[PDB]
Amino acid sequence: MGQYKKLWYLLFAVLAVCFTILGYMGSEVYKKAPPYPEQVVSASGKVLMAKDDILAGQSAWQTTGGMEVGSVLGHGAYQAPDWTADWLHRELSAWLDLTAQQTYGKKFDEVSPEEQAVLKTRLADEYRNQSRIKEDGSVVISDTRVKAIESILPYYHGVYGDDPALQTTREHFAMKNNTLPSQEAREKLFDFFFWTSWSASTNRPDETFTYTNNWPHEPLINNVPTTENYMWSFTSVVLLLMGIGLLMWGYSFLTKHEEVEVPTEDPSKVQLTPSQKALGKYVFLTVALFVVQVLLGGLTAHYTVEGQGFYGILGFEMSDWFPYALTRTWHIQSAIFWIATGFLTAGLFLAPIVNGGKDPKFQRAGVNFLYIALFIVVGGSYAGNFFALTHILPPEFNFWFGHQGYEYLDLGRFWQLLLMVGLLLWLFLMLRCTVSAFKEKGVDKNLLAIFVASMVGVGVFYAPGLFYGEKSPIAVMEYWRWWVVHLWVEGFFEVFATAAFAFVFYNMGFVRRSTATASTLAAAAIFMLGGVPGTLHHLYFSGSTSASMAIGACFSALEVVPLVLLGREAYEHWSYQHLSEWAKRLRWPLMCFVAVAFWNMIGAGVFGFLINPPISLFYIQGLNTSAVHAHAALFGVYGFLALGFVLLVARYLKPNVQFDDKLMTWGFWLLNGGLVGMIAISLLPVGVIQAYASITHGLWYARSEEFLQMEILDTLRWVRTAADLIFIGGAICVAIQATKIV
C-alpha cells in the first residue's frame, strides 16, 4: 500500500466499527420490536383479533399502496393523514367521551377541568400501563376501549370505501373512491391500524416510554419526548459544534493542495470502443426518464389542490385509473431509476478507459442485455403497480408482481430481484475491465483499488432490500429498507462519484496521483464514518429502542466534515482568467458540479440538520419539511451529478456537436430557480406552519384535513405551480440538449 497504509488502515477500522455498530443495532430490532400479540382479548373474554388478522391487515395495506396513501408510524405520503396518529387520537377521544358519560352524565367537553384531569390520568394509566403484553403473548383491553374502536370504525370504513357522506373527505385526502373495495380486507386493515396505534401508546416491558419512544406527540396520554431524547439531542448539537470548530481550526493543516501545472492537450484522446458507442441510448433513457418523472411530480401536485382532476370529460375518470397513489409511486420510482441509470452509464463509459481503451469480449452484448433488463424492470414494475392499485391483480401475487406498499421500494419482489440481477451484471461488466490494469508492473494501484471497491459497493449494496418478506415485522422491514434508501443512495454513491472524479481528474492531468489517491481515501473514510451509523436517524420512532436515538443523532452530526470543505476547492479555482484552454467549451457539465456543492451545503447540510436531532424529529417527522429536505438534497446533489455525468458522456460520444450555450444557460438557471422557488415560496412555509401546529397541539392536528384545508395552506400549494412550471421547462431544455447532442 506504500505511503497510503495509514489511510487504508483508518478506512478499514472505520468500516469495521461502523458496521459492527449497525449490525448490533440490527439484532436489537429483531428482539426489541413491538411484538404482534397472539390475541387481543376484551376484559370480558371476547377476542377482538389475532396475529394472523394483523398480518392480513398489513397485506391489505400493501394492496392500497401502503406508504404512498398517507403515512404509518411517520413514514409515507403527506396529503392523507398519518393513520397511526389519527387512529390513536380518535380512539382516545371516543374513550374520553364514553368514560365521561358513565361518570358525570356529560361529554368530555362539558366537564370541568378538575375532573378532566382525572379522566385524562385514568386514560393514561389504562393505555400505557394496563395494555402491556402479558406472559402468554396476549393483550387485554377494556370494554370501553372495545366500544371506542367500534364507534370509530365507520369513519375509516367510509374513508377507505365509497360512502357519499365522505366524498369530500376522500377528495381532500387525494384518495380514489374505492381504495380497498373489500369490506373483509378493510376490517383487517383497521386491525393493523389498531395494532400500530397500540404499539405507539403502550409502554415497553421494563420502561416508562412506549415502543415508539413516545411517538407521536399526543398530550392526552403524555406522549412527550423522553430524557434520553433531550440528552442525546444536546449531545449531538455539542458534537456538531465541536466538529465545526475543529474543522475551522485544522483546515489549513488538513488541506495542502499541491497543484499541478495545467496541460495543453486532451488525453479527450479516446478512440471509442463499440461498447462505449452503445451508451447514447443510456443517455437518452436517463433524460427521458427525468422528464417523465418531473411530469409525474407535476401531475401529483395537481391532486393536492383539486383531488380528482380538471376537465377531461378522456372519456374515463382519471383517479379511478391513475390516482394520486399511483402517480406518486411512479414519481418516486422514476427518480431512483434515472439517477441510478446516470451513474451506471457514467461507470460503463469509464470502464473501457480503465481497460486501456479496449473491449473485453462481449462487452457490447452485455451492455445491450443490461439495457434490455433495465427497460423490462421499469415497464413491468409500472404495469404491476397499475394492476395492483386497480385491484385487478389477485391479492396472493400483490407483493411479488404489484405494489409492495413500502416507499422507495414500491416495485414488486420479482422486479426487485431482476434489478438486483441487472446490478450484478453491471458489476461484472465493470470488474472484467480491471483485471489487466491490476496485472501490471510498476504502476501504483491504490487509486484503482479504491475505485474498484466503490464499484463493488454500488453493485452489491442493493441486496439488503431483499432481506424482508411480505409478513416480516414492520421494524425489521424498516431497518432493511433504510439499509438501501440511506446507505446505498446517500452512501456508496458519493464514494463512487468521488472515485470517478479523482480517476478522471488524474487521467486528464489536473491533479497529482498521490493527491487524488489520498483525497479519495479520506473522503471514503469520512463518508463511511458519517453515513453507515447515520442510518438510524430514520428509525427513531419505528419500534426501535432508545439506543437508535443515541447512535443516529451523534454520528449523523459527524457528517458535517465533507459537506463543508466541499467545493471550497472550486471557489479556490473558479477565478481562472481564461485558464480553461479546452474546458470552457464544456463549461456546463463541469458547472453541474458547482450547483452540486451548493445544494450539498444547503439542502443536505442546513435542511438536513434542522430535522436531524431527535428532539426536532419527534415533532416534524411526517411533515412537509421532510419533502423540502428530500427535494433539495436528492435532486440538488444526485440529480445534478447524474445530469453532469450523462452530459459529459454525450460530449465524448459526439465531439463534433456544439452545446448551444443559450439553451444550456436557460435550462440550468430554470432548474436552479425552480427548485429554489418551490422550496422557498410553497414548501418551506407549509412545513413551518405544520411544525408549529404539531408542536402546539399534536401531529394528529398538523395532519388533519381541517388543518390542511385552511385558506392559507391551499393558496400556498397552488402557488407552487409557478415554480413547478419553471422546473419542468428547465428539465425539458436539458433533455433536448442531450437528445440534440446524441
Ligand code: HEM
Ligand atoms: C416539477 C417538479 C416537481 C414537482 C411538482 C414535484 C412534486 C412532488 C409531490 C407533489 C410530491 C408528493 C408529496 C406528498 O406526499 O403529498 C413529491 C415527492 C417527492 N419528490 Fe417530487 N416533484 C418535483 C420534482 C422532483 C425531482 C426532480 C425529484 C428528484 C429527482 C423529486 C423527488 C421527490 C421525492 C423523493 C419525493 C418523496 C419525498 C418525501 O416523501 O419526503 N421530485 N414531489
Ligand code: HEM
Ligand atoms: C445528499 C444527501 C442526502 C439525501 C439524498 C437525502 C435524502 C433523503 C430523503 C429523500 C429523505 C426522505 C425521507 C422519506 O421519504 O421518508 C430523507 C430523510 C431524512 N434525511 Fe436525508 N438525505 C441526505 C442527507 C442527509 C443528511 C446529511 C442528514 C442529517 C444531517 C439527513 C437526515 C435525514 C432525516 C433525519 C430524514 C428523515 C425525515 C423524515 O423521516 O421525516 N439526510 N433524506
Ligand SMILES: [Ca+2]
Ligand atoms: Ca415520505
Ligand SMILES: [Fe+3]
Ligand atoms: Fe438519511
